[PDB]
Amino acid sequence: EVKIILDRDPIKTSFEQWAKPGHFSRTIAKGPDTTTWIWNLHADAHDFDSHTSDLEEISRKVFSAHFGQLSIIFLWLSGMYFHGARFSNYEAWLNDPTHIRPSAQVVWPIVGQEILNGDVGGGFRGIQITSGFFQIWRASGITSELQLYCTAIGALVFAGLMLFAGWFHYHKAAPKLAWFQDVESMLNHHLAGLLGLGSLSWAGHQVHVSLPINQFLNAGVDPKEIPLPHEFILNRDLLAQLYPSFAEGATPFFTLNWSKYADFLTFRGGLDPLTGGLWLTDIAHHHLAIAILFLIAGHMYRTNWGIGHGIKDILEAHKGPFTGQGHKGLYEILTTSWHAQLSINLAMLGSLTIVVAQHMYSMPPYPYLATDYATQLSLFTHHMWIGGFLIVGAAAHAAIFMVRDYDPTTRYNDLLDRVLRHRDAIISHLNWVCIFLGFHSFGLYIHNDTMSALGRPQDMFSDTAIQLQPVFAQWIQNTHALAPGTTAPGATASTSLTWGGGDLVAVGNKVALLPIPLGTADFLVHHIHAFTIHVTVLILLKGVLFARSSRLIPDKANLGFRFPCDGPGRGGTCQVSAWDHVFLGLFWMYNSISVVIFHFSWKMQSDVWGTINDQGVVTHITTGNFAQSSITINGWLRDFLWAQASQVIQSYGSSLSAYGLFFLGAHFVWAFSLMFLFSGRGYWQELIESIVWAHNKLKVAPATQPRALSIVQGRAVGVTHYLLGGIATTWAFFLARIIAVG
Amino acid sequence: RDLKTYLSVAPVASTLWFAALAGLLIEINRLFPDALTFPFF
Amino acid sequence: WFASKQSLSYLDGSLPGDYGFDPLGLSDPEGTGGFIEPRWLAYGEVINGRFAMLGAVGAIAPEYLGKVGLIPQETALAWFQTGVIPPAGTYNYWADNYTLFVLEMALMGFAEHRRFQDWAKPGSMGKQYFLGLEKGFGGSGNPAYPGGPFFNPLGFGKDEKSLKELKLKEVKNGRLAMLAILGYFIQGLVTGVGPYQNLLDHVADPVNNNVLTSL
Amino acid sequence: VAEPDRPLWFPGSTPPPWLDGSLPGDFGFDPLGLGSDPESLRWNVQAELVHSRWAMLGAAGIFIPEFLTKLGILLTPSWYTAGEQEYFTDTTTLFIVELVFIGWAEGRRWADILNPGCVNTDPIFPNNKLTGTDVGYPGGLWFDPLGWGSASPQKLKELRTKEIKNGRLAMLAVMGAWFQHIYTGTGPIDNLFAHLADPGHATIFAA
């Protein structure tokens, strides 16, 4: 076969269908008879494979939808750059980053809100931002508000192009099903074209704009005096005085004999003692390897020249004694089901966001990011939630595939088979591990609480009594310390300062990073992590494996992916559906992530962040109480929650009172969720009966018959507010705390 | 386009209505702030 | 039955300058819509070529002449140097640089737009809207060659089937100019100096000259 | 009285069906399909007519800076800044007075749009009457003394087209003047002269 560009001519464009609500569904396009109609309209709006059964049409819908998504992201980026141009103190912050608070939002003087425009420094009144954009912009060598303004226009223009493309590829030239399926092609391009050229491109701006300008900023020269980026490209003299390797052209690269380029590219590693961020000389070099690597990787798959790989070939040839003919037929499944692809992608993109958070705190990439605790606590916590959510979404679509696309008669797999043929063995074991982890992580805490309360500190699990020293993580930690020179001779300093041992970095009076200690307190929390994660996995995997059938419900697959139950029979069968497993898994992801970000916040303030003076004396924020008081639930209640929540409950009258409002505001919607979660629509519908009576009495009863929320929606509404309330509370709590104290 | 008019007057009618209301309320306040009572009688 | 490089089914040889070369299969007509249609490309190579055919000359003619011709301050700077502001910094002109472009876009706007109409409609352009030349307009059956007369005052092989033996000539030269200009973009970009001026260094001595040498 | 072989704004294109050519000033121009439906169109036609007529009076506003610049006169005050003046009784009062008369003028034309009649009378003297048929062409002595308004199609069309075309031109004009002042902070005519002196460098770009 030969891969090519395939499209079709115009397929309609009119406001006619805008005027017709629920047009996409044949059931709902007839209009409402009850208020249920309205909710269904929004819940089935994006269910494309529920609209039609043609794979070509569904594929064309999701393709333009991605253009729509990108359009928004570009419009969203356009605003952040614009606000950094009109309503910000970036130019002020650019001179004194260590003392001036970054702010990019001014509030109108109505009703008394102007109080939120607090003293952020630089003779500026506004709201302190924790997005981190200031450190990105300084890293890109962005000097003036003009350049941020130009990027704002550039992003807005791109937003228009993205939006235009979506219309063009759904209404004008719609890609054919064969085009979407060319996966050997797409992977080649996304590997080489998007990632390879993308990383290559940024490696260029760095070694021409970022690296030159950043050196000036660090020398201490006034930002307004620093030559524009284009003065470095034109006159190579400027980029020759600093980084003299530029004296030659393509040589030595072209003549190989690498390199005299060690001058602006190196494997130094560690952290810049003056900026607190990763060496820009390393990052530029880093993107150089990433480019080439992905450019190499972009030539694995065979297309139109017989050289490369057929993915279908690779899979089929991977079969063992234990697994059967497994992997055979996976290519046809993954090229035929969107949900199958989305599940894998969510699981992986979500997992990636989580490693990003752990990598950006321990290896601070942007200049003056480490000592801005307000941002670092926000960035880590933000990615933890984003990654956390995306992972739960993988379970949902894995389940949807099982219900909707799974067909043994047409697209058998054998690997997917067998798994279903011992799903009780997998779930029963995962059940056991969770119970073991629960007792052996949380039970240790309850032990500690009881012994402490009985006045038996020596009978506790602690560093001063019965120690549970996490030696495996400690040994590794030590190994990365002895890594440079010994294992990796090219590396000058350690990978991270958490592995440094006897190295510390400070910017201003604040600590950027230092070796992070590990003790019994860290042992207990990690098993708590190991525990909470497994239970989340249990709920979701159980939902996927038993999505189709069960000893209780032989034909669950016929009931669909999202149904309330199958009645009170068989003892009761509420929340048997795969949807309800995602619903239940959502709470447990929340439970797990919440104790993760609390683990972060306390550990950093207690053992890492704090004030340092020029005598070496380090004074941490909470003063190193993590080791002796995080090993007790009462300790978490008192020394963590009670103690640190004082900032947000004492923020009224201050610039941080909005956090005080959102603190209580989020407690409200959280408790509000409990009305929906603890009750059933049977009561509410009967209550509405008495209320409907009153309206009929006064001739003001609506034709659209009011109905209580569906059983599933009641759960959807409940978990949504439980999440919004709980997460927003910690948000207000975190930001108020870290902005006031930090 | 008849039809475009039709997209409108949907729940976009709510937002256009409430945005107008919000504006009116805001201007009133900007004009008469901090009012705890009706003092004209 | 003709010289050819690479493989594709629809490169009949019915198009001028067809060497049957489309490794990317851009002209494959399986799925067509947009700007990926084959005929459009046929028209485009020719337009791009005509313009390129013309431009290459502009790029060097001023260069060359000030060299052995009567050109003073208006001495051709690099082709690149007059128009783009940073290197040469440009030259003043009877009119403001930005303004000319507006006028320039204005004039082109008329000729270019109409040409498109020829492509969207056969004789639409040549039909209606007053003024002479409208008759001039609509000429030909094919947009690529409006068959000016007007565009072709002198039959010039138009009548002879030999016009084919011109088409290709036009086509081959076109690719040639195209290629050329792309060269400048690099030559001028690394070399600085002028494409023609650049030519001499290779000329003064060649061993010394060239890209490897250039580096 | 439709003409389909009429010149179009876009020579190559095809005009929309609603733009019949019967109407005056029809060059088949409604890319957004604003006049897509008959009811909307009638309204739009009336609106354009009014804008055009008002814009033309406004064009005179362009006229005054001419005399003041060279001839002189008491019209020296630029149209811009003209409003904030002390003549007579204060502007606000003037505006209020204006609102009442003109209101009666439309609370006037409006009835005509909605209906076909009301021209039929002078309320005070129910005999003065006056009539012109057709929409925004009231007719009568007050609005059409010379009576050139009443005539024949072809003639009316030609005349009417002239009314609209000048109006469209006038509309751009007025807008152009308003923008012209802000971007240049001067008189329009000055802009005009300046341009002629140096059309080569005197443009939006000059600033």
Ligand code: CLA
């Ligand atoms: C790549 C990301 C991605 C994509 C493309 C999809 C796509 C889809 N999902 Mg999946 N999902 C995802 C991630 C994703 N999901 C994640 C991360 C989770 C874990 C929570 C889920 C869990 C999930 C479930 C349980 C279900 C889906 C379903 C669907 C399908 C229809 C959904 C719909 O109509 O939209 C409708 C959109 C709404 C009704 C918007 C509701 C607003 C939300 C609930 C609250 C937003 C609040 C906001 C964040 C902040 C508050 C602001 C407020 C004050 C204004 C559609 C194929 C449904 C399906 O049946 O599949 C076929 C289904 O039941 N998804």
Ligand code: CLA
């Ligand atoms: C704080 C309240 C709370 C507690 C304690 C639990 C506890 C548990 N949940 Mg539940 N869950 C909760 C809230 C809670 N959940 C809420 C609000 C929801 C709604 C979303 C869920 C939804 C949910 C699901 C879907 C699942 C669980 C599961 C589990 C079990 C996990 C396995 C385990 O750890 O074993 C260990 C038990 C403990 C750690 C409890 C404490 C034990 C104490 C400390 C020691 C014993 C005391 C003493 C010695 C006993 C003798 C006393 C004598 C006088 C009687 C565990 C029993 C999973 C499961 O079934 O397990 C495999 C399961 O799939 N939960």
